[PDB]
Structure formats: structure tokens, C-alpha cells
Design a binder for this molecule. Structure first.
Ligand SMILES: OC[C@H]1O[C@@](CO)(O[C@H]2O[C@H](CO)[C@@H](O)[C@H](O)[C@H]2O)[C@@H](O)[C@@H]1O
Ligand SMILES: OC[C@H]1O[C@@](CO)(O[C@H]2O[C@H](CO)[C@@H](O)[C@H](O)[C@H]2O)[C@@H](O)[C@@H]1O
Ligand SMILES: OC[C@H]1O[C@@](CO)(O[C@H]2O[C@H](CO)[C@@H](O)[C@H](O)[C@H]2O)[C@@H](O)[C@@H]1O
Ligand SMILES: [Mg+2]
Ligand SMILES: [Mg+2]
Ligand SMILES: [Mg+2]
Ligand SMILES: [Mg+2]
Lengths: 421, 421, 421
């Protein structure tokens, strides 16, 4: 039995009092994670190669995930059963090296570690034919499923409160990877087509996006004992709200009282991203990100987000290091033109298993400082039935209220482990 | 650590739109499973032989089961903790080869794979003394527990709404197996006695079945590189509603609003079943079932169910096959005499680990067609307080309503893995 | 992968009817467990040494716990994710042999097996530096976290119903162990300081304990092939309600309707405990406890509890034994001066893996008799809003009601396994 997974767990304090607090910019889809993670999260994977004859094999893999508040010993939770799939490798003679698979799977996910941000993730229930050797690269085909909680009506209606039936969304994914385009440099291209897939006689609200595309281009360059990844993605309509390869064609969301409201996602997203991790000598490693993400919707409630950060690591010893993370977010509301910004600074002393910035496990002792200035926020007051602005970006002081996190400061400290195995 | 279990997971589409739909006859207790399974289901077993001295050993076994809708990646659920037991083998010198056990256990279950139907299952919390060598066969004794959600009142009452206290049911099970009765043929006999087991001063509703028996006879014949099982079972009163060896003596059920209603199970069940799996040459395997099950209740709301189906497999290659499944159900309401029927046809291309129809894992690509014609259904409209017919079989058009699945067609397709290890 | 854990599971009957019932004295914090455990409880631990170079290593450990009613096969539950931590051993050159750790962990827990009673348990999310070699002993430092469900208000208020915000409690723990003080005798000393840790501008109710101390002294003596532990603990204010090393500074509790009520824990607790397990020849083992615990609160609602019990084991054979357990509880309400008492007698035939009273797994067949006489109980009628006495000790016949378990008898029997591996 193969035992693999991911986990993080710790204990933290907020400088002004109480348990650790974590700092994310209103409107940003990520935060700089170092010394800024407020939950115990674990994935326990049990897998096995259950049959092997020569070059041919079947591999079975599972994944059970737990997320708890880490404020107590006994923390009862609903585990998420995320993966259960079988991979059949080298079973098709005319397509040597290629894998056939079906089941729930984390399918070739692309992320930026330091902000824990997945930018290409179509994971879910699915099936496909992977790694077809096409001479100048590897071709992979897959179909995966996601579902919105409501969005569909069984009868013709102009009332959005009738659109409460779950709507399956399908994604069809084609990727062509490992194209050697320059010395030490590979290129990967992907296309995703996603669409709401309605039951017979069901309908989406008038104007629903329904379907959409996501186009990806990723260049990977071997540099300074590490790598650089330069990414450009462009998404359309139904693919803009999740933004990582899953479709949300219904354009319907629900408040806490189960009232439906319209979040039409017609429009486009442009994401330009560069990240990597490099070594400078034998004492220094560094991770870095810079990203510009523009989500432009027809309803005007999109966002324009810039991020940049660095995470240098100084190795005193093969297992002991000093790690620092500096991260900056700036988010502009499309609706109001206001801007939200934050800069976060973390200092950590770390013991890790190996001398790389990728080495895990790691035990950290840290101190974090964040300073933010938010001039807008989302209006989630009342409910969607009472409030016509429910879910719209709004200036910080709209109607005498307070929206967004204001203009303030805070520091946290504590200890944490992180591991993948 | 031994890692074992069962899992199935896939992605599917309904021809008229939306996610895969699965087809079961109203009134039947099973469906033809090939290309007709609409959830991700997994049992993860971790066990260990924790002590061994010579012939003597203790084995520890567990089982955590997950069932999710396979419509999304993150699917939070309540896992069922189904097994946790210790088996002590060869500990009693005067009963060589026998096992003593206690804990929650899947105890000698008998099922028909292709319709995923358990016909002899008393699994639950329990204890027993298994495999006593009695010369001409093996004798096993066990006691297991189940519990109805309500059914018991703490005081004398004529109001069925007072019978809301959980009622434990005990089953006492004696089996005599492995009797060689003919060349290549074994016989197994079993008796189950089950009864509601009331707390001091609690009561069942007047007329409650209370207790009941289940008698089983199974003949196993080695034929054509596989087997044939011919089964006859007869159950009485409290053993008829579950019908696999667990008792439900209280005869009380609850609607969604927690209103109690009477489902007295006085009466009998006769089940005549034949199933097996045979090989025809080196290229053909086949599974087959035929069953007749008559549940005759004093209240007239029983059923009379006929099933038959076959699942031939053509082996093109040692790992690649074409599998087809054809299944037919016919259910007659005891109450009205109407009939519900369905025929399902599935075609699949499959890659599996081995050249048997029992070989797992298996990756399937399938297409399923079902056609049904239902003239009756159960009335679950209103609640048990408003509706005197709550839970009764009822003609399809009763009182201008629509009951059962009507007279229609549908086709589905998709991909799926199944594995036991 | 290392597979470790704890589990118990069985089936039982109550002499007067229905499923097994378990017997605990009102006011006691424990019960004599043999033949007196009414649930299936399991901890499944998966761990791994993920990196090792010479003397240095990192160990990763997890723990998922399940507790179900063992009344049915399919028992869906919320597993508790109790442990997820990394232990870095021998990483600090100037502190040889010491371990640095962070994550959720069962930290050096001290319990009395036979009454399943933890007397020193600060487990939870935490971090620390363990086993510092200090010449004449081992020094350990740790900080762990716990949280009360409510207790904090965001604004100044005299209304206890406003104090509904969770309040983090921190515990700082220092232990000095393994001091050889006499031949075959070790001494361990510990100090815990715990305090409610309020968010900025939040408050506790007027008079809240807020913080407190727990002082522990444990002497361990090697005797008669086993051991004797003699324990003295003294706790103050916020450390008295949980009583094992976790703080509950807020002094606020909630009824079932979410009404807050005051359980101020100002006062002190004195615990004097002696327990051990000894061998008498080759045929006899015995576990025993004696404890006096006095919880003296300023509000008068504390308790004074005496327990004593013994568990002799007669070994007929290396794997087969006859086990008996006799246990007595006596609890006096501080408020009324009434006394609750119970004596429990259990007889079991057992098969176990090894010839010790500590050997597991064990398969038991038992009969239990309990006789109790309770002259007081806690008033949990109405809710905290209607009832001024909510939660107070009260004479058995207070206001014509019935409080406590009365004056009665009962016997149970069944089978059970228990294992740790
Ligand atoms: O698939 C990535 C996706 O998973 C989520 C949970 O829905 O994040 C969790 O899982 C990740 C590993 O699979 C971790 O990186 C992350 O810390 C954890 O919360 C989404 O947030 C993420 O986009
Ligand atoms: O004990 C069989 C019994 O389990 C149920 C769930 O209550 O079926 C689940 O478990 C079986 C394996 O233990 C699978 O065959 C089945 O697919 C799964 O749903 C009952 O349906 C069944 O009678
Ligand atoms: O840490 C001990 C603490 O855990 C509890 C559950 O909250 O007990 C459970 O876990 C123990 C093992 O970790 C078992 O000994 C016990 O039987 C089980 O209920 C608390 O009751 C106990 O104080
Ligand atoms: Mg402005
Ligand atoms: Mg008719
Ligand atoms: Mg739940
Ligand atoms: Mg009195």
C-alpha cells in the first residue's frame, strides 16, 4: 500500500489578542500563505499498483481530505472524498506509454505554491486518455464533471427563485505538452470547452452564459537549478467565475436563506502569470510570483487584480533555514473603480527535511505583519430578496455602512508544520 | 498493514440531457448494475494480523465506507464506520480450526454480483463461533444486532405517534455448510430467528409482528469452470421487510416530517433464486441470474417480483473485452394487481486486470438503454398525518396524480471503473 | 506506512430488556469500563518516518477517530480529525535527543486504563520542545490550544446572552520527568498555566475566572513486575472544570436552545490518585485504582468524589483468562450535601494475545451487575432562560420531580473486543 498526501497544522496567536488571524485582500482569489494559514488541512492518500504484467499495469488511488479549525482536540468534520480512480497504463498497443483512466481524480493540476493558487484545475469525476506520444509532444484528452448547486428550472419562468435545480457542467479538455521549443524550455498548450448540460425540458435563466472556453499556454524554462513558468490564459463567459477550467453556465447563486440571485458571468478573463523557484549559490533559494488577472464581466462586477511576492530562503545548515515572505495584492473593483491593497511580511525560522525550498516536511516558527487599505467591499447585507445590491462591489462607506476590511494593521506569530509525502 | 476494499467511480451522460440517470423498477429491490450505477461508492479496509503463535492468530479488521454523488471534486460526506472486529483463530483446542469473533463485521454475506443484491446478510455489531468442524460439514453460530429508528412507546398508547423510541432487533443465526451431497456440489443450510428486543416497560403497537424466522438453503455446483448457485429462502413476519436476515419487529416507519405510520410486516416471503458464472471455451464468460420473490403481507401491500438477466463477456484479448448486460424486471403489486416492468440493455468495451468476468479492476466505456412501463407506484404524497394511503401501492393515475415512472425510454453512456482488492 | 490505533466494539444485552446499558454515577467523571462500554470507538493512525539521516529524523503522524452507537451496520458519523503533526528529532545539536514538534497531537497523556480516565491531558493543536536532557531529568516545554463554544462578547454588556463568541484558551506546559529519587522510583513534576485569550475589544462576563493553574506530581514505582503510580494534582479557577490541563476561562455554557448560563469555575480542585498494575506469581495479574477528587467552587456547585476498584485476572492458559472487575463510586454534591453511590461487578471470560493484563487484542464474554443509590442529580429541565436552577445539583425529589438515577439495580451481558496496536 502506498501512503501519500499533503498536510499542514499549527498554532498561532494574533498580536492584539485571540487566535491567529489570516489576511487576504477583499477581491483577491489567494493570499501569501507563509505564516498566514489558519486551519489544519490534510489529504490522506492510499493507493496500490494492483496488477502488473511486463510494461502493463493498473494503479488504484484514493484521497480523503479533512479541514478543521485547529482550535480543539476533538474536531468532528465531514471529510471530502476527493479521489477514487484507476489508471491503466500501456494497455493500448497502438498508443504506447499512454494511460486510460476513470474515476474522481486530481487531473494534472497547475498551481503556484506560495499563494496556494491553482490556475489550471479541472479535477473531479472524469475519464480520459493521457500521454499519447505524438512525436513532437504528449497529447492528453479528458472529460470531467462539476455541478452548480442550483440554476435550472423545470418549467418556463421569469422568476429567478424557480431556478433551484442543480445544473451539471461538463468540461472537455485537450492538452499538448512537452514541446521542446528552446534549450531547457518546454511549451504546453491547452483548450477547455465547458458547458451547462441541462436535463430534458429544463432551462437556464434568460441571458445565462451557458458555455465558455479557457485557453492556456505555459512555458517552462530550466534556469538556475530550478525553473520559471510563464503562463497566459484567456477565458470566456461560463469559464470566468471559477477561472481554473470548470464551467459555471447557470449564472445563479444562493444567499444563506436560499434566495437565488443573478451572477451572470458573460464577459472574459485574461490572466498573465509568471512564477518559479531558483537557487543562487548553495545558501539561497527563492520562490517568486507576479500575476495580473483581469475579470471583465458584462454586468460590471468583475475585478482587476495584480499580485507580486517573493520568498527567499537562507540556508544556515542543511536542515535549518531562515525564510522570509513578502507579498503584495492590489485589487480594483470594475464596478466602482475603487482599489483594495495589502502588503504582508513574514519572517520564519525553519527546520526542514533536506536543503531545498521545496523540501518537506518543514517545521516553522514565524511572525507575520500585514497592512491593508480597502476602499471597497462586497455587499452581503440583508439577503438577495431584500437587497437589490446583494453581492455587488460597493464603496467602503456605502449608505453609512462599512464594507471591506477598512484601513488597518495586524501582526501574528506561531508555529506550524507542512508536509507532502 | 493489509489494504483491501471495494470501489466504483465514473462519469456519465443521459441521452436526453444532464448527468447519467440510473434505472430501477418501482417495486424491485435491485437493478442491473452494468452501466447503471450513479454514485461513487468506496470501502477502505485496513486490517492486520496482530499476533501469531504457531497455528493460533488474532486478525484485526476495519471498514470505512463513503458514498458520494460524483458530481463535483469536493464532496463532503458522512463516512459509515461499518466494520471493526477481532477474529481469534484456533484458540479453542477442542474445536480445531474454529474462529471466535466480536465487533462490527460483514458476516458471511451472500450476494448476486450483477444486480448488486444481497440475499443473505446479517452484518452488523455481533459476535460468534465460526467454522466448527462437525465432520460432515462446518457449523457456525452468530448473534448480530440491528435497530429500527422508532417503533417503541414507553407508555400504553393507542396513538401510533407515541411509538418513536428506537427498537433494537436481535438475530440468532445458525449455519451448516460445506456438506458434500453430490459430485462437485455443496449444500449450505441456515436458520435465522429475529425479534424486537424491548426495553423494560416499553411496547410495540398492537398487532406488531415482533419476531420472525428466515430459512435458507443454498446449493453450489461446480460447472463449466465456474459455478451455479440455487437458493431457496422462506421468511416470516418481522424478517420479510428487510428480507436478508435482519428483523424489523416494530412495524413502524416515519415520513419526512417524522410522523409515524404502520407498515406491519406480518405475512411471509418466498424467494427462489438461481445465479452463477460460467466459461464457454477461452473467449466467453457469462454471469446470469433468475429470481422469483413473493412478499405476501397480511395488509396486502406486498409485491411479487420476477427478474432475469445475463451478462456475456467476449474476450478479444487477455485484458480487453466486450461486455453486454441484458436485464428484465417485472413487479406486481399485491394490493392492486398492476404490473411494473422494465428491460435494460447495456453494451460496454472493457479493459480489465485478468481474463475473467470476475477480474478487477475494470475500466468500462458503456452505452445503456432502458425501456419501462409502470402501471403502479407508491403514494408518498402529503405526509402520513394528512394521507391515509401514505406508503400504499397505487395505480399510476390514482386520483388524477402520477405514480411510478410512467411509460418511457432513455439511454445513457459514459465511463466507469470498478475494483475490489 | 505505520498503522497504529485503538479500537473497541461489541454487542450487549440488558437483563430487563433491550440493548446493553452502561452505568456511570451521576457526578463522577468516569465509570468502571469492563463490560460497561456502550459504543464502538476507533482511532486509526497512519504515520511514517519520512526522512532520516544518521541520528536525525522527521516523523509524521495522524489520527482519525470514529465513535458510533453499534446498533446497526451502516452507521454514518462525523470522524474527529484529532492528530496531524510532525516530530523533528535530534535536529538541534546543542540539545541532543530533544524533539521539536508542531501540529495536532496527543501530548504525553496520563490515564488510568480501567476507568478510562485521563488526569493529565493537554492534547490539541500545539507546538513544543520535548525531552531536553537536563542531567538529572528530562525537561519538556509545550503550548497547546483549546476553545470554549461561547463566552466572549464584542461589546460591553451585563446580559449573559451576549457572550456567544468562541473564546480561545491557551495552556503553557512545563514538565520535568525521569528524576531518579529512589530505587526503582521516578518522579515527574509539571506546571500548567492556562488562560482565556480574548480578541481585541472582546470581554468575559463580570467575575469570569479567566485563567488558572494546574500543578502535577507523579511518582512511578517499579513493583511486582508492574508499577504503581501515585499522583497529586492541584488546580485553580479556569483549570478546574475540565480538570486535565485545559483552561475554560469564560465560565459560560449553553443549553440546547443556545441560551447562555453561568458556570463560573472560580475555586480549586485537589486530586489524589494512586493506580497501578501488578503480577502475583505466574497466574495472577491485577489492576487497581483509588482516587479522591474534590472540586470546590465559589458558587457551591462542585463535587467531592471518591472511587476505588480492582481488576484481578486469573490466567488459566497463556491466552485464556478469567477477568473480574469490581468498582465503587461515591459522589457528594457540594451544593446539597447529598451523596450518590454505585458499585459495579463484572465477570468476564477472555481470550487475549499474550499473558498480561495489558495484552491486546482481547475478546471478552461478560456479565455485569450494577447497583446504585442516587440522592441527587443536576437540574436540566426547561432551559437556562426559564429555569434559574439550570445546571445546579438538586435533591432527587426536588419540587416533585425526579433527578439522578434513583435507587435501583441492573445486569448486562455480551461480548466485546478491545485492541491497541
Ligand atoms: O484542487 C485544488 C483546490 O482544492 C482546494 C479545496 O477545494 O484546496 C485544498 O486542497 C489543495 C490540495 O488539493 C490545497 O492546496 C489547499 O490548501 C486546500 O485548501 C481549493 O482551495 C483549491 O483550488
Ligand atoms: O452489506 C451489503 C449492503 O450494503 C449496502 C449499503 O447499505 O450496499 C453498499 O455496500 C455494498 C458492499 O458492502 C455494495 O455492494 C453496494 O454497491 C453499496 O451500495 C446495501 O445496499 C447492501 O444490501
Ligand atoms: O484524550 C483523551 C480524551 O479523548 C476522549 C474523547 O474526547 O476519549 C476517547 O479517546 C480516548 C483515546 O484517545 C479513549 O480512551 C476513550 O475511550 C474515547 O472515548 C475523552 O473522553 C478522553 O478524556
Ligand atoms: Mg471612493
Ligand atoms: Mg390499471
Ligand atoms: Mg455531518
Ligand atoms: Mg436529602
Amino acid at each position: 500500500v502506498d501512503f501519500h498526501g499533503y498536510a499542514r497544522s499549527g498554532i498561532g496567536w494574533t498580536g492584539s489578542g485571540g487566535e491567529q488571524q489570516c489576511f487576504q485582500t477583499t477581491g483577491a482569489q489567494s493570499k501569501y500563505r507563509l505564516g498566514n494559514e489558519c486551519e489544519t488541512y490534510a489529504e490522506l492518500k492510499l493507493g496500490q499498483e494492483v496488477w502488473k504484467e511486463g510494461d502493463k499495469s493498473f494503479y488504484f488511488d484514493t484521497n480523503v481530505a479533512y479541514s478543521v479549525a485547529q482550535q480543539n482536540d476533538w474536531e468532528a468534520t465531514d471529510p471530502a472524498f476527493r479521489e477514487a480512480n484507476v489508471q491503466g497504463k500501456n494497455l493500448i498497443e497502438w498508443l504506447p506509454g499512454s494511460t486510460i483512466w476513470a474515476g474522481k481524480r486530481f487531473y494534472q493540476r497547475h498551481d503556484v505554491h506560495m499563494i496556494d493558487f491553482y490556475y489550471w484545475d479541472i479535477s473531479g469525476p472524469g475519464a480520459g486518455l493521457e500521454n499519447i506520444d505524438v512525436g513532437f509532444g504528449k497529447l492528453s484528452l479528458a472529460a470531467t464533471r462539476s455541478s452548480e448547486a442550483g440554476g435550472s428550472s423545470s418549467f418556463a419562468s421569469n422568476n429567478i427563485y424557480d431556478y433551484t435545480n442543480e445544473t451539471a457542467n461538463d468540461v472537455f479538455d485537450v492538452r499538448l505538452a512537452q514541446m521542446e521549443i528552446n534549450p531547457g524550455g518546454t511549451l504546453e498548450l491547452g483548450v477547455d470547452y465547458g458547458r451547462a448540460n441541462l436535463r430534458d425540458n429544463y432551462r437556464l435563466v434568460d441571458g445565462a452564459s451557458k458555455d465558455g472556453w479557457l485557453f492556456t499556454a505555459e512555458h517552462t524554462q530550466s534556469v538556475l537549478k530550478g525553473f520559471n513558468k510563464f503562463v497566459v490564459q484567456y477565458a470566456t463567459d461560463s469559464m470566468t467565475s471559477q477561472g481554473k477550467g470548470l464551467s459555471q453556465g447557470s449564472g445563479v447563486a444562493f444567499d444563506n436563506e436560499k434566495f437565488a440571485y443573478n451572477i451572470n458571468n458573460n464577459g472574459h478573463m485574461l490572466r498573465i502569470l509568471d512564477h518559479g523557484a531558483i537557487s543562487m549559490g548553495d545558501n539561497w533559494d527563492m520562490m517568486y510570483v507576479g500575476m495580473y488577472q483581469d475579470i471583465n464581466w458584462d454586468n460590471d462586477n468583475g475585478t482587476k487584480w495584480w499580485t507580486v511576492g517573493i520568498r527567499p530562503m537562507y540556508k544556515w545548515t542543511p536542515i535549518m533555514s531562515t525564510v522570509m515572505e513578502i507579498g503584495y495584492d492590489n485589487v480594483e473593483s470594475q464596478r466602482t473603480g475603487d482599489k483594495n491593497n495589502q502588503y504582508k511580511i513574514t519572517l520564519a525560522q525553519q527546520w526542514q527535511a533536506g536543503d531545498s525550498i521545496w523540501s518537506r516536511p518543514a517545521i516553522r516558527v514565524f511572525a507575520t505583519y500585514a497592512k491593508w487599505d480597502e476602499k471597497w467591499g462586497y455587499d452581503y447585507t440583508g439577503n438577495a430578496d431584500n437587497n437589490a445590491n446583494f453581492g455587488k462591489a460597493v464603496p467602503a462607506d456605502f449608505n453609512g455602512g462599512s464594507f471591506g476590511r477598512g484601513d488597518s494593521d495586524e501582526w501574528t506569530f506561531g508555529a506550524q508544520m507542512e508536509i507532502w509525502w
